[PDB]
Design an enzyme around this catalytic site. Structure first.
Site, PDB file in Angstrom:
ATOM      1  CB  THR A 191      -1.299  -0.007   1.176  1.00 19.21           C
ATOM      2  OG1 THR A 191      -2.057  -0.841   0.698  1.00 19.21           O
ATOM      3  CG2 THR A 191      -1.625   1.718   1.632  1.00 19.21           C
TER       4      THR A 191
HETATM    5  N1  AMP Z   1      -1.424   7.403   5.557  1.00 16.81           N
HETATM    6  C1  AMP Z   1      -1.939   5.905   6.391  1.00 16.81           C
HETATM    7  N2  AMP Z   1      -0.751   6.243   8.007  1.00 16.81           N
HETATM    8  C2  AMP Z   1      -1.300   4.933   8.829  1.00 16.81           C
HETATM    9  N3  AMP Z   1      -1.576   3.894   8.099  1.00 16.81           N
HETATM   10  C3  AMP Z   1      -2.171   3.746   6.536  1.00 16.81           C
HETATM   11  C4  AMP Z   1      -2.276   5.350   6.244  1.00 16.81           C
HETATM   12  N4  AMP Z   1      -3.405   4.875   4.886  1.00 16.81           N
HETATM   13  C5  AMP Z   1      -3.835   3.578   5.118  1.00 16.81           C
HETATM   14  N5  AMP Z   1      -3.225   2.611   6.000  1.00 16.81           N
HETATM   15  C6  AMP Z   1      -3.955   1.288   6.586  1.00 16.81           C
HETATM   16  O1  AMP Z   1      -2.476   0.534   7.030  1.00 16.81           O
HETATM   17  C7  AMP Z   1      -2.798  -0.577   5.704  1.00 16.81           C
HETATM   18  C8  AMP Z   1      -1.708  -0.866   4.437  1.00 16.81           C
HETATM   19  O2  AMP Z   1      -1.262  -1.732   3.626  1.00 16.81           O
HETATM   20  P1  AMP Z   1      -1.921  -3.003   2.943  1.00 16.81           P
HETATM   21  O3  AMP Z   1      -2.588  -2.549   2.621  1.00 16.81           O
HETATM   22  O4  AMP Z   1      -1.359  -4.459   3.760  1.00 16.81           O
HETATM   23  O5  AMP Z   1       0.054  -3.283   2.275  1.00 16.81           O
HETATM   24  C9  AMP Z   1      -4.159  -0.505   5.059  1.00 16.81           C
HETATM   25  O6  AMP Z   1      -4.840  -1.758   5.323  1.00 16.81           O
HETATM   26  C10 AMP Z   1      -4.722   0.695   6.221  1.00 16.81           C
HETATM   27  O7  AMP Z   1      -5.903   0.407   6.752  1.00 16.81           O
HETATM   28 ZN    ZN Z   2      -3.245  -0.602  -0.377  1.00 16.28          ZN
HETATM   29 ZN    ZN Z   3      -4.243  -4.294   2.510  1.00 16.64          ZN
END
Ligand code: AMP
Ligand code: ZN
Ligand code: ZN
Length: 382
Positions: free
Chosen positions: A47
């Protein structure tokens, strides 16, 4: 006054999700504008790496946000819940579109886009915040709506909007689940309320709009979870990361044992010295990348052992972070508005190409980047 850009990210929306009759507003928007068959994430299909690639036009190898969790010699550890790391400009390489906008006298406003909590190249957006969980759909939609409508000196050329809800339901229950479909419907409906209010405000007609996602989502069936220490024991190598892109750093003098047990093909993963990784991934040159990188197969997770017990073994779940050339990892790209074509479809393309299009629409000189500025020119009206 030039036309604004609205940049919307729906996290983990897979590219085929527009063709299931559950995105009426996004489907209408695509008919009205421009739709790509899919948009392929950069490696790793995670992400933070991919949101930042989207705004920089750079591969994670170049932009330095190489994983969600990282270590650096000078900066120490980085992860999504260590706030003064995420807010430290030094982690974020290159120039994201909001920095390019503010540097021209114009203004950017971000709802929680990765990198927007730091003064990247000493430049913060005019609107930004610290991401917090569980914010309401209508709260963030109505805030973005506010910022598109502002004028005078606090007029924004760029406004970003982010939604986690779809991504989080995919982890929880898989992409073919009814919860994932409800999340998609909910975010689609929220975007329709934004769009309707923009028309009522009379900002819709002068705002270009781009909707993307950072990657898709694969189904992770029950029993598809292993220990990172099944790959390499703690005595030989430290698991820097878990999930689907596993990085090991061998204990001092264990490079040879780590490699003998880790490198090559295994049941449900493969591993590589970072400089020998598959070149199509364009990854492994950045010092912040661990010495050994393992890629789990589609549908499989390797977790830190403490997680592996407390993971209530039952439900179908999901994950991304797999090979970006997998159809399951495919993200969305659509666009619509005054400077964009109407009723047009585009071949599948790679997410680094999005930067060049936004830079033009935002009227900023395009920063050096890894993308091809020819790819998305057909997306432009003329
Ligand atoms: N700006 C941010 N700061 C901290 N956490 C976030 C942010 N944007 C999204 N997230 C969370 O972090 C996760 C990203 O990890 P992944 O999707 O496993 O790559 C998502 O499921 C969101 O709920
Ligand atoms: Zn993502
Ligand atoms: Zn994810």
């Amino acid at each position: 006054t030039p036309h604004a850009l609205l940049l919307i990210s729906i996290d983990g929306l897979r590219a085929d999700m527009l063709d299931r009759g559950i995105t009426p507003n996004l489907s209408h928007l695509a008919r009205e504008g421009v739709r790509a068959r899919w948009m392929a994430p950069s490696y790793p299909s995670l992400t933070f790496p991919n949101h930042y690639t989207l705004v920089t036009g750079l591969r994670p190898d170049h932009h330095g946000i190489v994983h969600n969790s990282m270590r650096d010699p000078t900066l120490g550890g980085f992860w999504l819940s260590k706030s003064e790391a995420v807010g430290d400009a030094r982690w974020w390489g290159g120039e994201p579109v909001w920095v390019g906008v503010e540097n021209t006298g114009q203004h950017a406003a971000t709802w929680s886009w990765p990198g927007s909590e730091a003064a990247i190249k000493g430049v913060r957006p005019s609107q930004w915040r610290h991401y917090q969980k569980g914010v309401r759909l209508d709260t963030r939609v109505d805030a973005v709506r506010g910022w598109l409508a502002t004028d005078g000196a606090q007029r924004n050329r760029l406004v970003t909007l982010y939604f986690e809800h779809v991504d989080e339901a995919g982890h929880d229950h898989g992409p073919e689940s009814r919860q994932y479909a409800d999340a998609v419907r909910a975010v689609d409906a929220a975007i329709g309320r934004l769009l309707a209010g923009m028309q009522r405000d009379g900002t819709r007609a002068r705002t270009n709009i781009i909707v993307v996602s950072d990657h898709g989502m694969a189904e992770v069936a029950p029993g598809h979870a292993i220990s990172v220490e099944d790959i390499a024991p703690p005595q030989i190598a430290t698991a820097i990361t878990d999930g689907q892109v596993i990085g090991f750093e061998p204990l001092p003098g264990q490079q040879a044992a780590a490699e003998a047990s880790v490198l090559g093909a295994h049941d449900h993963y493969d591993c590589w010295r970072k400089a020998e990784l598959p070149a199509r991934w364009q990854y492994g040159s950045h010092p912040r990348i661990p010495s050994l990188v393992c890629q789990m197969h589609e549908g499989w997770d390797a977790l830190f052992p403490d997680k592996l017990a407390k993971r209530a073994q039952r439900g179908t779940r999901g994950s991304h972070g797999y090979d970006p050339a997998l159809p399951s990892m495919r993200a969305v790209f659509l666009a619509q508005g005054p400077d964009l074509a109407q009723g047009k479809t585009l071949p599948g393309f790679d997410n680094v190409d999005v930067y060049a299009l936004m830079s033009r629409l935002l009227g900023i000189p395009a920063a050096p980047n890894d993308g091809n500025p020819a790819t998305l020119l057909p997306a432009l009206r003329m």
